[PDB]
Every structure is written in structure tokens, then in C-alpha cells.
Amino acid sequence: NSVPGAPNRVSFAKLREPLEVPGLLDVQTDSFEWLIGSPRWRESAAERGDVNPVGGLEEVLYELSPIEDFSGSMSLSFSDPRFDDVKAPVDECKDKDMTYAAPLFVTAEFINNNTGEIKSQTVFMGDFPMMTEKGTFIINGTERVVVSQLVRSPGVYFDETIDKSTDKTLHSVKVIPSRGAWLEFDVDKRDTVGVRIDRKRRQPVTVLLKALGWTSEQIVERFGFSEIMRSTLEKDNTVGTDEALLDIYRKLRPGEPPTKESAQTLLENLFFKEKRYDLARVGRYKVNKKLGLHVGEPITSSTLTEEDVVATIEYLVRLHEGQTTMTVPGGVEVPVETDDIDHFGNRRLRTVGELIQNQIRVGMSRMERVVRERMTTQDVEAITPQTLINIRPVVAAIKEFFGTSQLSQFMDQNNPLSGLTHKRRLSALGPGGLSRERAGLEVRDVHPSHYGRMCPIETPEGPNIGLIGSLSVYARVNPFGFIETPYRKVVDGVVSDEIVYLTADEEDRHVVAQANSPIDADGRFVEPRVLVRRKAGEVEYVPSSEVDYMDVSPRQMVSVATAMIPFLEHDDANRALMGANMQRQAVPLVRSEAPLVGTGMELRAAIDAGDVVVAEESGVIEEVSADYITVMHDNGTRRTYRMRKFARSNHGTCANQCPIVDAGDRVEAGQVIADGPCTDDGEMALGKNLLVAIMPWEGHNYEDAIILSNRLVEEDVLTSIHIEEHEIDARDTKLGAEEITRDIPNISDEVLADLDERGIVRIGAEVRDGDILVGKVTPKGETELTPEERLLRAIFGEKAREVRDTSLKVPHGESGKVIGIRVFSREDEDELPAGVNELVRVYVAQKRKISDGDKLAGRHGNKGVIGKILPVEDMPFLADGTPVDIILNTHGVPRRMNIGQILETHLGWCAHSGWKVDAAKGVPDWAARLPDELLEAQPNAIVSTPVFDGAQEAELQGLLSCTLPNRDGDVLVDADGKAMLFDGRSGEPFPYPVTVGYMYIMKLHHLVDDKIHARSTGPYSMITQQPLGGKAQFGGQRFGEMECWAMQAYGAAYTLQELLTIKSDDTVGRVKVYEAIVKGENIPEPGIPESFKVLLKELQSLCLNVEVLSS
Amino acid sequence: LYRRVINRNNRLKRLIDLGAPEIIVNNEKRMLQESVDALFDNGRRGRP
Amino acid sequence: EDESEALRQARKDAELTASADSVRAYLKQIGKVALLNAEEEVELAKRIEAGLYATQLMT
Incomplete structure (x- = not known):
């Protein structure tokens, strides 16, 4: 419910469930709104932290201003960021290749110190790119999305190592800041606590303390229990604050003559002045939490401090001592233990707002440098x-971030699910993040802190396995960048309805219950012993009194794409991963009927994907057509929505938008008003419902091969529309x-029959491989011709034709009609790149049928290419003559551990046929827990089994028991779920029953x-x-080293010589072999490879005399 | 890389036949040496 | 301290260094001679003028 036009x-x-699914685009929208300073984010922050609501731009300008000279006799300041209206609408930008942006205005103030003068001016910062209603950016026409990044938050991180030789623990600590230098206080094999700074290992903590100004008496007083540190004091062999500073300078600054005043300020510059050492607000908050300095102080002064350093050293020494709790003098007590990098209490999420803020800061730093220089x-x-x-x-910084940056990814759109899952995407790799080659196996693991914050299932299965993840459905992002998770707090066994958001630290601190805990429909637990997750991720049985938190709802740990998989709890993990990753590559068909059996995360996923038009204000439909809808609001005003008829997606797929309302209907604000590419009646539809058989059929469905009925080809059940564009620019020369x-x-x-008078092809004129699309001619110039060419020209009377032909030809292997032609010009004043006088775009679309080799897949990762499309007659059919549509293989089901497909097939058959539980004498026991209005269902009715709380196997058996007949008296499917199929090729019935049903399958984007x-x-x-190489050019296949090894091992020589000499590199050999083949002569002997000649020249160029000798 | 080699060699020639202090001459010679080293193997020694 | 050869020994040890950075080596090289004053510049220029007159009269 909760959706006015939701299909039943x-x-x-x-x-x-008490908590509904939040706005799935919040992670992008709220982040960018916080960056801007929008009133929505401002009022939200006022609700949740009104102490200091500051936008990203405001924070940058405040931390920049004021800017002073060296003399400090004059200054400049920035204040009050303010945006302007967008320069062009979204569709116009996408058409004319502009960037969706808005002007930036600031109030710069110039102040003189000695004399005193204020100069306030309105300064135009630049055309700031903007984020659309769907949370995506438009750069140079195309749509882009900046993925959130997973980076480890700056702060203190303690760890212990084993030396495996003397077998003693060696603790350490890394105070890793942002925009600063490193420093580590480890524990050695001996008892000399090292203070390696900037990878220079020497100089125990006594010298650092003396340089900071601590005398030996103070050191001993503050650290009396530390036998290691008292030993270092005894063997310090360095006395004097100035002597310690001298040692610091000669160590950290080799090659510079040390002085007594440069050293006195070097440490302050390196770790106390914010100019060169500024751990962010997240770093300061993390340090404060880890040591417990200030518990109520508003966060500011992001630079390090000597009290923090001494607290860190004391933390290290007490951790080595083996204590359990620590109390900083003047601070609250805090437990002492090692810190884990993979814990989500330390891996903050740098979202789009923070990324763009960082780029803004690094640009404004250069701007301030230029201002200071010219000032x-x-x-x-x-x-x-x-x-x-x-x-x-x-x-320039903004542009160079938006373009050419792997965190600003080309927004893939094969379907609304693909777009939605490309948003909410967490990528651990990027600038400032770990690379794949340095990515050890330790980080590619599902830490027990990921429950409810990141999907353990959905992740790429290639080389990026584990480095890319997606947010959970209920997950939320902290202002610092941590990932929150809602929970229902339970008090003395009473499960309340109050929802409290917790991060990893709070979740580890407290004790959480299980989502499917058997509540008593009143707030209490029926059984005192309930499942519990402990601090270390341990799973135990605990009395209900100690439980103080509970999951909001089942399927909280899972992401959207994986939550769309029915019967997930019965599938394995690898195949669930494959199905989740391969649900996002489905192509939009021409009908897109809704799935029979699914989950509750299709309607929400479709309407939150932004690819479905939804009425913003309620009213009555005034005019409806195939191009526009006019909704007559309740109060006078009207509004027209423009559909997108056959718009090209970024990956060459149709993007039709068909209305689903009539001329007299009334719609409430929030109702789905028009379908999208992969939608049906508002909810999601990535494929079709097809009759399914699980028998191996004559070896055509062998080893993940798929057989299709010709009915799909005939009725266009699986037929996609693909739109390709061609660009040719007539430019100056x-x-x-x-x-x-x-x-x-x-x-x-x-060939000029299809070309119009101005050169371009006609709209709707079909094209074939090798045709002419745009007729362009280039000045050839003066070139000498062959005497035979001169003789031919003289014979035939043809002129020189001094210009060269370079016309836009449709590439190899394309066909289809031509939809529209968009042609630019310089004479009509269009924004074209310099040197280009004429640009024209031709859109070619083809109605690709289904065919052998095409990739098909269900929702449980049971992929497979189409082996053979049989005719309708020679396919197994039921007793009533209805032929099955697809034929899977039985051998592929058990060894892949994905019987979720079998359960989905059974439930789909039940939904398609319709059932009726016969409660003549009471409700049957198996259906005791079945909800109402489910004992009986109409034929072709839709059902919704959620992810981790759905239809049980006993309920499936009961439903299959009552399978009310189709048209006559006939139950084609028995209790077991099988049927009597007749062989349509031979004629005799199959000797054993075969499982049948309606599985939901999708057409993948891996077409032949x-x-x-x-x-x-x-x-x-x-x-x-x-x-x-590659299909983009002509290109040839790569004959790799392994293929060469196999060629050699075969005892083969001549084939290797051919493939390596007269097929790839012999410049004077390829032409000879082509001529010999054409004329019918023997293949000539090869020559030495041009690549080898290049290698010889390179070696000679490296001052290595290489001479090839005959004898 | 070849342009840097040629430029530094020519500048060294100009400094030598003009007459320059040993500091500048040695600095230019080190410049030429480092440029040739970068040309033969970039990043082998020092910052690439 | 400022005496007792500790600072002097540290300074000479740091001066007899590698400084593999070419730019830093050049900077440490130039940072040897002290700055001058206008009278010193005038005297030096007079010396160069005398030298050039001397060599041209040799020619």
C-alpha cells in the first residue's frame, strides 16, 4: 500500500514492518543539497543538529577567508555563497550538449588594515554543475553519476603484531591524518618505543617529549608504571630540550644547517599549525571518541595538539602493559583495545558532496595562491x-574532476534498475583509495559490521570482487560519512515502535535482536531465548531481558537489486551474487509485462528510479495522448508532462514512456502516470513470464544451453529495440x-537514391551495411597519378575530381530504419567546437528478434545462451495441447545450489493457474499462518513473496494441492508439481512426469x-x-603466448610461422600472400618480422651494439 | 625526452663557450646527466 | 647549546650530505655566499671595467 495507484x-x-523503505536516492540528493546549502537540508539539520548548519561551500569559504599577506597589512575575505537559476533546462542541455549548471555568486570583501577600507563586490565564481531530480549530473550532454567512495577515516589506529622469532607482542599506532604527514609509535623487539616520523625510524619517545618541552621528572611522573619507557629514559643518552630539538632537526631535515629557532618552530609548523596539518572534522571527532578528551565541546580547531600526542603515547604504553580501561587527566575513561581498518566504524563514506567539496577546496587553494601572489x-x-x-x-578544477576521473562514471542505463543500482554504489577504489594491485584479500571480505550497511551478496564477480558494493535498503549516511542503520529499541522485553539510528560503534556496544523474532503481537517475546548478534559478530542465544535492540524488518541486510530476487533464502550465495549482478543488464522489451511472482521491492524500486512519470499534484486527467498528458489540478491550474518516445539510452536501448491513464480518470499526487522502459502498471518488469520445462531435450539444452519455442519469435515476446547514433563533422581543413x-x-x-538534396539520408529510409549516411567530401589536393590511371581517365573522358570522398558509412553488421536526423550548423549560430563548421547526427534503430546465441537468465543466476529455437510443433506440450516455451536442463539445478528457481517455478505455476484452499471443514493446518485473501486467487493473479520472510515449502505444497482447472475438468499439474508432457517430435508421451511452471526470465545485454x-x-x-584490435576498428584476434605454447607443443611449425610472419608483421609478405591467394598460386615463403626489426632498432638505440651474423 | 636532452646539451655548450662559473657549469652538466638518465630509464633513480 | 662543538659538528655533518634531490642540491650549493651592498657592487663593476680595458689593451 501507501501508493495511491499501486496494483493489488x-x-x-x-x-x-514498522519502518517503510526510505528515499532510495537520498544518499545523492541530501549530500548534494548539503553541499549547496539548500533550505531543505538546512531545516533537516536544524531538526537534527541546529548547533551549526554549514554547507560545503560555506565551510570552504569560511576556512579560506580571511587571506593575508606576509606583512599582514591588508586582507581579503569571502562570504555568503548564493546560487542562480539554471541556464538551460535538462532536455535542452541533453540535446545541445551543454552541461546542466547554474551560476555561482559570492560576496568578496577587501579590507585594508593600516588605513582601513572595505570593498564589497559581487563575484561570479563559475558555472556550477547541478544535480537533477534523479540525482545525476549532465556533462557535455551525457548523464553522469559520481559514486560514493569508501575510505578509511583519519585518526588513531592501534594494532599488535607477533615477531614469530622471540614470540612477544609488538604494539604500534598510526596517527594517519588527511593533508599531513605520518608518525608512528611502535614497540620494538627490544624495549625502545620508536617514533618513526615520515618513514625515518630512530629516536625513542623521550626525545620527542623533550622536544615538546617535557622534562624527565614530568615524564616519570606521567608514566611511572611504564617499565619500557623508564628503560628508554635510562638509555635516552640525550639530555636537554635544545639538544633534543637539535637531534630532531638533524634527523628529519638532513642537509640543512640547524638553528635553535628554526627547530623551535618546525614541530609547531608540522603538527600544530593548521596550514600543513589539518585532519578533518571526521578525524578530530574520531580522535576525541578514541581518547575521550572532550565529550561536550563543539568540534573545532582541526589541528593536532600535544595533549592528544601524549594521550596517544600513554594509550600505546598501557595497551602494551595489558590494561582494560584508560582515563586521560581531564577526560572521561575509555576502553583500550586494538582497532580494525575493515570495521565500518572506521571506514567513512566520502559521498558526492564531500568529493566535490574537496575538488572545490583544491581549486580555491590555487585561486588563493594567485590572489596572494598578485596582491x-x-x-x-x-x-x-x-x-x-x-x-x-x-x-578548471571542477571540470577536470567531472571529466577524466574514475569516480565520475558514465551512468550506465540498461534499465531503471541499472540506473538505481549504479546510484547508491560504494566503490573502494579511486583517488585516495586502494588500487586493485595493492588490494589484498583481507579487504575483499564481508566484515561482520556490514550487516545492514552493505549488501554481502551484490558485488562484481570479476577482478573487482569485493571492492565495489551497494548500500542496503534501510541504510543511511551520517554527516561525518558513517553508515547508519535503523533499529527498534526494546525495553525490558517490550519491543517499542521508536526507531533509533545506530552506527557500527553503537551496534557493537549494544545487543541486537533478530528481525524474525517471535513477538507476541503485544510487544513481548514468546520465548526468553532469542537470537542475538554480539559485539564481535558472535551469534548466541540470550535471555530476552538483556536484549536492547532489534532489526526494523527482515531483508534489512540486503540491497535493492538482491531484494528483488524471490526465494533468496533458499538460493546459495554465489548464484545469488550472479543473479543480482545479472538483473541489472536486462534490456527493455517492447511489451514489458509484470512478473507473476516477485517481492515487494519492485513497485518502490521502479517509482524511485526516476524513469516513471508521476503526478506531483492531484487532479483529473484532462487530455491524454501518446506524447503528452495534461492533468487538470484541483485548483484551476494545469500541467503537461512530455513523454520520451524512443529516446536513446547511454547503452543503446529504448526508453519509451507510455501513459497508463484514460481521459476521465482521477489521479492522486504520487500515482504512477506513465510507464517506463522496464515497467508495467507502475511496478518493475525486467522480462516476461514463460512456461518452463526441466527436462534435458536431445542434447540441445546441454551444459547451460537454452531451447526456445518459436512462439517468442512470432509474437515478439523477447524482442528489443536498439538505437545507435552516428556522428560526422564537416570541419575546416x-x-x-x-x-x-x-x-x-x-x-x-x-547509392544516391536514398540521399536527399542536402546530402543526408531520408527519415525512415532503411539502411544496410556499407550504405551512405552522410555525404562528405574533403579537398584532396595535388597528387601524382599512375600512368595507367591517366590512360583510363583519357579513355573514359572523366575529369580529375580533385576532392577526396570521406562519407559517413554505416559500419559492418548494422541495419534498421532511420528515426531522426539532428544537424548542427555554424550559420545558424550553434555552439560548435572550434574548427567544426557542420555537424550531423543520424539515429539508426533495429528491431532485434531473439536468436540462437543470445543470453537468457532467470532471477537466480541460471544463465545460458539460446542453443536452438525449435518450431512450435516439435516442443513438449501438456495434456491440453499448450506447448511449453523454454526448456532448461535438470543437471544444472542441483550442483549450482539454486533450487530457488524450482520454488519460483512452482509458485509461478500456482499464480498463473489460480488456487482455492477448500476450508469446508476448518482452515487446513498447513495454511494456518497464511494471511487472509490468499486462500483463493483468480487465474493469472500476481503474488509477492518477500526476501527473508515469504512463502514456506508447506504452503507451496498446499497451494499446489489445489490448482483449479484451466477450462475443462483437468489438473495438468499433480501434487508434486510435475506434469505429463507429450513429445511433439516423435509423439509418444514422456515415460515420467516433468516439472513445469512459469519462471520469470530476462533478455540480457550480451546479444550475438x-x-x-x-x-x-x-x-x-x-x-x-x-x-x-577490437570490434570498433576492424581488428584481429590476439594470438597469445599460451596459444603459441600450444602450437609448439602440437609438434607444429609451419602454422606457427604463418600466423606469426605472413599474417601479422611481414609488410612485403601480406601483399604477396594476398596476390598468391587471388591468383591461385602457392603461398610464398615468409620474411623476418617488422616487429623484430623494430626491436633491433630499439636495442641499437639503447647503446647496445646488436649485429646479426651469417657465418 | 629527446627535446630535453638536446636543450640541455645546447645550453651547456652555450654556457661553456660564453664562460660561466663552476657552480653553474656543474649544475648544467648534472642537468644533462639526469636528462640522459631519464631518457634511458625513467624512474630508475629519483622521482620519475 | 650554541657552543661546545655539538652544533658545529651537527652543522658540518649535515653539510657533508648527499641531498639526492637535484633542486635541493643546487639550492644548498647557492646558499654559500653572502649578500652584497651597493658600494661592493660599484667596486666590483669598476674591477670588471678595469679588467676589460686591460684585456683590450693587451689585444
């Missing part, structure tokens, strides 16, 4: 802030100017037409003379 999808959920050179009293400020570094015209040199009038490739002779590389 009956649910199998046993227990109610002294230019004469005083003659400058204004407009002359002072340079905004080019800031805008040195020898003249290229023009787009019909007159193409050395061409016939046959995008994969098939061939090459005989194409373009060649530049430095080496080997052929190119």
Missing part, C-alpha cells in the same frame, strides 16, 4: 576584489573546407550481433605493423 499484489509476508605585486589602494580574484583555477553534399566523387547514382566479428585484411598499427 498479494503478499506472503508473515510479520508487519603584493600590484600597487596598494588601486586594486578591487574583481582584480584580485581569479576563478579559472576553480572552474588546411587545403580548403569540407562540405556536405550529394556530389560524391567516383560514385554511382544507385554485438559479439560476432571477422577480419581478412584491415588497418594496421603505426609503430609496429601488426593489425589493430
